[PDB]
RNA sequence: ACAGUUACCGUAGCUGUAGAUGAAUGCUAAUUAUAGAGUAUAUCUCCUAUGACACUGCAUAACAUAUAAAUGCUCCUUCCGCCAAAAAAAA
RNA sequence: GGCGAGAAGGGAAGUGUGUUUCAAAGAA
RNA sequence: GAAGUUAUGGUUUGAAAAAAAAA
RNA sequence: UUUUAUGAUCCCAGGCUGGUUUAAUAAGUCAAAGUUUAGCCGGGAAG
RNA sequence: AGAGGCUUGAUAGUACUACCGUAAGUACAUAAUAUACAGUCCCAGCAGUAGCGGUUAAACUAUAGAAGAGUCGAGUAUUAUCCAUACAUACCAGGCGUAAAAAGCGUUCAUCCAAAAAAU
RNA sequence: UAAUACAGGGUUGAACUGUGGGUUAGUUUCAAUGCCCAAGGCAGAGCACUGGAUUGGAUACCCAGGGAACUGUGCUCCCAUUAAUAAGAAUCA
RNA sequence: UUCUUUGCCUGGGGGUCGUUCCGUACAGUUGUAGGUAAAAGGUAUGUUAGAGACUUAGACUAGCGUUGGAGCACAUUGUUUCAUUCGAUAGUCCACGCUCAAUCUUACCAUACA
RNA sequence: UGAUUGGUAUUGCAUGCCUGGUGACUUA
RNA sequence: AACUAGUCUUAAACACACCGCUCGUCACGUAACA
RNA sequence: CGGUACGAAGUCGAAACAAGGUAGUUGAUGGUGAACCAGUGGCUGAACAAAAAA
């Protein structure tokens, strides 16, 4: 049966799934009040996480500005082939089931067993997929844990509207000063 | 010995090589014989 | 090259003898075969190892 | 499988006992590692082919720029080539011919290139001649076919709402000897904007 | 890679080429689309209304659509989910070994605990639909408020294997016996290619050249239609 | 060769409807094959002889008496409640029982949520049970969804989106 | 790592196909995109939108890492770069 | 008068060139 | 500045010096 | 007395070293040996 | 065709980096062409080992042979170079009855390995 | 391959001994016939050659005769070169 | 594809001053050109065997008659002619095609009409 | 007492039909 | 004691199948090495 | 020079493959237009024929 041509349903983002209005109430309140109506807040109240939100507020902002600068309507915007395609599937599933009234997301994803790709099958570190392991009643030798990769990162230390200065950091240097 | 033995087969050793064992249309040894 | 002079390699096959409750078994859980309607009474009742107990025979000098 | 690296000296013996098969490409040795070599014509004939093919095959004996002299086959139908003559020689196996393992290059030194050649012209160097040049844009300009079905169609959806190329409407659906017009703006568009384009 | 493939060229889609197959010739055939798999999850429309005003009566859902974009939460989603609920709480429900022994069970079945969504099956303070009531939780002690217990909200797992089943279900004689048939049917590339898409071959083409290529088509196979329609058209004709 | 779990099958396309045949999975499948004579024949044995090699977690726990864990199950195969736990009991056994038995204090930490019983099946819907905590608009959105979940109308498929 | 090599199996070569070059040759292109519509004729269609839909790799265009073989003849090299703080223009 | 200046070397060398592992203080 | 560092191809054609003696 | 089949005696040919990415459960150092700005070195003379 | 180069007898899975059946260039426009045909006849010629051509060739020549077909594309093909794809340079990873390969039978030096491996 | 003389190796046992070995070139004892050399030299048989036949024909097969070779502590190891497909350890009662 | 150590092989196949060493000698020699897509091991059938065995089925043998010896007829061959049409050619051609030819049959030749 | 669409020209090594010779034709 | 048809065994480098396969000198041109 | 590889098939025989019509082939030889022949010693990569016991 693996080669039954079945079909699954198709996957949506959440800022395209929530109803358009929706999305405009939560920029008029971002756009009022960042402090109040923060992002977190905004996301525990209406369901959503605070990337949707973002992506949310980033969106209706600009087609905003598009609208009232006259620049383009919402059907001029030059996109690409993938924003299109998106656009006719959550065309379609707001004719379909209607557009959600309010988010269903999570606000913090839990630690829950799930398959994710082959990626997520295996211990990359140890570079095994099975644990063989003896039978006993009594404790066995501890393993030996890996220790944290020490590579280096640059952290910006000064910016200003001509030179940007930045630390270039390496972890494994013992004498820092 | 795979082209050795061809080249002894179709006959070049037997006339370019000396022979301790003579023969009379075989190339002879001079020397004393010993085994190389 | 040759063919069987692999003695303690491929000269020998090392494969699981499968008896009546385990092909029966294997044939329903992957659904080929409707389960027969002995396959509870042999189940419950499973075939011994003779294998092992063919290997217990020693020879002995007379 | 380790029994060929056994003592003490096995880095010295192993590395000699490997596979000494001829090089891959040795058919063409006498070219010296180089993509082709001059030549001159020595001697141009016909040799006959291996059995169980028959016919004429068309060689030359060439003294290469390093001296060698080889035999080289002449691919194309008819050749210019006589004693004295120079050709550029390539890497390339006449399997019928007893030991010809070259080829000669079309179109370079004395060697003409193959006379009434259009396809292939590339491994004879043919140029694209002007009047191939000329047909492969003058064959695209398309033509006008219909199937009575596009008759169909417009006398029941588009005479009614015609434009003519001078922009006159249609006052009556297609007669019997009256073709589907063509489309003002679609019919032969490419074409049209290489031709419009040029001037 | 560069250049043009050297070597053999077979369609990516599996099927055979040859005279009275699929594809005439070998090659690629990236563009044909017809010979894989593509889901019909939006609408439908036909070339013509025959109702006087433009209703929109033409236009039709996909039976795909009902897969692609599915429903959740429908009243057999809520009875399956009630059924393997109480079958899948069979193994706590029926543990009689001690309290210990009862939450581990519970929480192998129901991951639970602190800073943890749980559907607080077991909780004290949750109601059950128990087969024999019993006091909550020996006069003695007892809740001398009202304090109605809480619902049991579901087990998230179980409710999306329910939900998800959905995609995975799936929808005398002329006496004439067939000799030239086959045992054991038959299993060609073909069958695997259409629907299984990482097994495909991935283009080294340019995707300026798959679109030109779509628009030549679009201005080409209409004319070769038209050159075969109207041959057999002047082959009619000329009969008559 | 094994693949990590999720990859599939990789092999020739002309073999890859063998490979599904042979309903192996996550795996790499190459011939080398014979350059004499021969082509299927004997590469026929020498597949054969190569599936003959394969065997499973359970067949090497079982042999050996260790543990094999496949790391996204473990305990799959090894793991076994003992009976013991699930062993029904009358009323007046049970009080017997509770005589005979040495009570035991409980263990808030290793006894809490253990207040389960014989269940049935029975229908729920939590998902739109009205609160005092809920906002506003999360009532709204949720009476109506639960309107839309159990409305007769349900289950209705009609092609046309303007029906008849 | 697949196929082919005239009954079948085994040796054994041979043939095509990958990759690294980027060295010579054949055919071919080049000064890179001037210009800016509306009714583009029909059918269909509650994202109503010049939507389905269909000439603009079309732009602030881009253009990269390693190299410089051999023989003969003629000519050229001579005022190299800075410092007068190399006691200078000098209250 | 003072500093710098090899058209940036492939003309020697096989157990060599270079590589790897080390070591190198004035004001004693 | 020091200490260690498998040789390869041309098919290769095993003993080389010193010392002794000689005149 | 000193070398020498662990290649003495004794011809011809060649300076050595590094270069990050690098697909495939073929990688945690590209995995016997393949490089590309570069590193180290490569006499003396107005007698 | 916004464009050319190569293929247009069989034969090679056309790889491979994120995704790993979770989708629409999905529907209409919109259905196909070449083992059709023509010139030559063991000639001219082609081709990669095999091979094709014997006067009706999907194998040579011809693409107005049709707005033909396959791939790549401002490029593409031929030749050449190799650590030349597992012509496993065979340590991973080949052989020595019969198909290449056990020295004519033996005594030994040096090396190599064994028996108190790893450690000392 | 009878006896005798001089030497091995194998088998069986007792004692001794105590990892003392497996393989082996810059090694060399032996090794069919032929050829070279030396010996002898006509018991037999027998190349080349002679002549008696068969064959279109034979320089052969058949017959008669035949001075080459048939016994060596020499020269000496070419081979379809000698108990095999190299020697040793392990797996078996 | 258990381990140790020597010897040898790389498709087939071809040609071929180093010595203060006694030199037409000693020592040493598989390898470079020219050809090549094969070559070669086995098992399975068939065919053949100036190889063998067997049944005794036919053949022999035995009995009744022939033919080669003479005459005639048919066919064929050789010869000849303007033409004496043509095919058949060991078994499986030769009283065969032609189970019957003075005319016709006639398909051969000559003449003159289209 | 009811005529007709050339060739007894080559090619049986293009064939159909038809013959000669030799082989076979075994099951429950 | 012989022959044909078989039938059986053995050998084979035959498989277009003994009217098979197959060796060489000489003659004949194109070449490499020497 | 003698030998050697390719194309062609011409003259002369019939050396091998069956007991190939004298088994084959091998070491070093002698002889011969050619394949080859003869002796001697090797092998099988050869055949034929082939025992009762008094």
């Not at chain 4, 040795?29 to 016919?55: D, F, H, M, Y």
């Not at chain 6, 009476?143 to 409305?151: F, M, Q, W």
């Amino acid at each position: 049966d693996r080669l039954l041509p079945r079909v699954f349903p198709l996957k949506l983002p959440a800022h395209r799934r929530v109803d358009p209005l929706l999305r405009e109430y939560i920029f008029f309140l971002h756009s009022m009040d960042p402090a109040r109506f923060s992002i977190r807040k905004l996301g525990e109240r209406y369901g959503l996480k605070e990337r949707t939100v973002e992506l949310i507020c980033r969106e209706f902002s600009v087609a905003e500005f598009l609208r009232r600068t006259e620049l383009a309507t919402p059907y001029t915007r030059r996109v690409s082939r993938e924003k299109a395609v998106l656009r006719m599937k959550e065309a379609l599933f707001s004719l379909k089931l209607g557009y959600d009234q309010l988010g269903d997301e999570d606000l913090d994803e839990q630690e829950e067993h799930e398959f994710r790709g082959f990626r997520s099958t295996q211990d990359w570190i140890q570079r095994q997929n099975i644990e063989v392991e003896m039978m006993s009643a009594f404790p066995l030798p501890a393993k030996r844990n890996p220790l944290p990769k020490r590579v280096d990162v640059d952290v910006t230390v000064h910016n200003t509207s001509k030179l940007k200065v930045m630390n270039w950091i390496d972890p494994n240097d013992k004498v820092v000063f | 010995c795979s082209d050795r033995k061809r080249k002894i087969l179709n006959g070049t050793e037997y006339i370019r090589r000396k022979s301790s064992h003579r023969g009379r249309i075989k190339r002879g040894s001079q020397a004393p014989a010993f085994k190389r | 090259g040759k063919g069987a002079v692999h003695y303690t390699g491929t000269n020998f096959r090392r494969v699981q003898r499968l008896d009546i409750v385990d092909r029966m078994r294997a044939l329903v859980a992957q659904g080929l075969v409707d389960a027969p309607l002995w396959l509870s009474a042999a189940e419950r009742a499973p075939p011994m190892e003779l294998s092992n107990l063919k290997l217990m025979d020693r020879k002995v000098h007379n | 499988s380790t029994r060929s690296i056994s003592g003490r000296l096995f880095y010295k013996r192993r590395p000699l006992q490997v596979p000494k098969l001829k090089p891959p490409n040795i058919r063409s040795k006498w070219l010296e590692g180089a993509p082709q070599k001059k030549g001159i014509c020595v001697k141009v004939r016909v040799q006959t082919p291996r059995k169980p093919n028959s016919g004429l095959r068309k060689v030359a004996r060439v003294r290469l720029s390093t001296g060698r002299t080889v035999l080289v086959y002449i691919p194309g139908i008819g050749h210019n080539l006589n004693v004295h003559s120079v050709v550029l020689v390539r890497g390339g196996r006449c399997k019928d011919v007893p030991g010809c393992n070259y080829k000669a290059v079309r179109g370079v030194a004395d060697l003409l290139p193959v006379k009434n050649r259009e396809r292939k012209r590339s491994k004879y160097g043919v140029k694209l001649s002007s009047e191939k040049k000329e047909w492969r844009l003058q064959r695209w300009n398309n033509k006008h076919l219909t199937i009575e079905k596009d008759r169909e169609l417009f006398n029941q959806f588009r005479w009614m709402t015609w434009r003519n190329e001078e922009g006159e409407m249609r006052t009556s659906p297609l007669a019997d000897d009256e073709e589907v017009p063509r489309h003002t703006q679609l019919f032969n568009r490419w074409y049209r904007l290489k031709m419009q384009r040029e001037g | 890679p560069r250049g043009s493939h050297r070597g053999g060229v077979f369609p990516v889609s599996g099927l055979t080429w040859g005279m009275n197959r699929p594809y005439l010739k070998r090659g690629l055939y990236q563009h044909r689309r017809d010979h894989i798999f593509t889901p019909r999850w939006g609408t439908r429309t036909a070339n013509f209304n025959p109702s006087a005003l433009p209703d929109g009566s033409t236009r039709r859902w996909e039976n795909d659509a009902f897969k692609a974009w599915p429903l959740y939460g429908l009243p057999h989603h809520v009875k399956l989910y009630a059924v393997n609920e109480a079958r899948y709480l069979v193994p706590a429900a029926r543990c009689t070994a001690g309290p210990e022994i009862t939450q581990y069970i519970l929480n192998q079945l129901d991951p639970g605990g602190a800073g943890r969504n749980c559907s607080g099956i077991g909780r004290p303070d949750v109601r059950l639909p128990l087969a024999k009531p019993a006091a909550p939780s020996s006069p003695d002690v007892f809740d001398p408020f009202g304090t109605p217990l809480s619902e049991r909200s579901r087990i998230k797992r179980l409710y999306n294997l329910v939900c998800e089943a959905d995609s995975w279900r799936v929808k005398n004689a002329f006496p004439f016996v067939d000799e030239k048939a086959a045992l054991v049917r038959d299993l060609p590339l073909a069958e695997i290619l259409y629907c299984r898409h990482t097994h495909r071959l991935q283009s080294r083409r340019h995707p300026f050249w798959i679109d030109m290529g779509y628009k030549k088509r679009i201005v080409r196979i209409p004319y070769l239609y038209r050159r075969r329609v109207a041959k057999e058209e002047a082959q009619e004709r000329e009969f008559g | 060769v094994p693949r990590p779990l999720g990859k599939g099958l990789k092999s020739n396309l002309r073999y890859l409807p063998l490979l599904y045949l042979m309903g192996i999975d996550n795996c790499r499948v190459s011939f080398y094959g014979p350059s004499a004579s021969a082509r299927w024949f004997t590469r026929a044995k020498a597949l054969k002889r190569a599936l003959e090699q394969l065997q499973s977690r359970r067949t090497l726990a079982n042999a050996t008496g260790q543990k094999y864990d496949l790391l996204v199950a473990p305990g799959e195969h090894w793991m076994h409640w003992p009976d013991r736990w699930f062993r029904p009991i009358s009323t007046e056994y049970a009080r017997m029982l509770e005589r005979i038995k040495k009570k035991r204090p409980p263990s808030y930490r290793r006894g809490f949520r253990a207040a389960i019983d014989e269940v049935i099946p029975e229908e729920i819907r939590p998902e739109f049970t009205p609160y005092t905590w809920k906002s506003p608009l999360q009532k709204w959105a949720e009476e109506l969804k639960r309107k839309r979940l159990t409305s007769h109308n349900v289950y209705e498929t009609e092609v046309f989106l303007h029906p008849p």
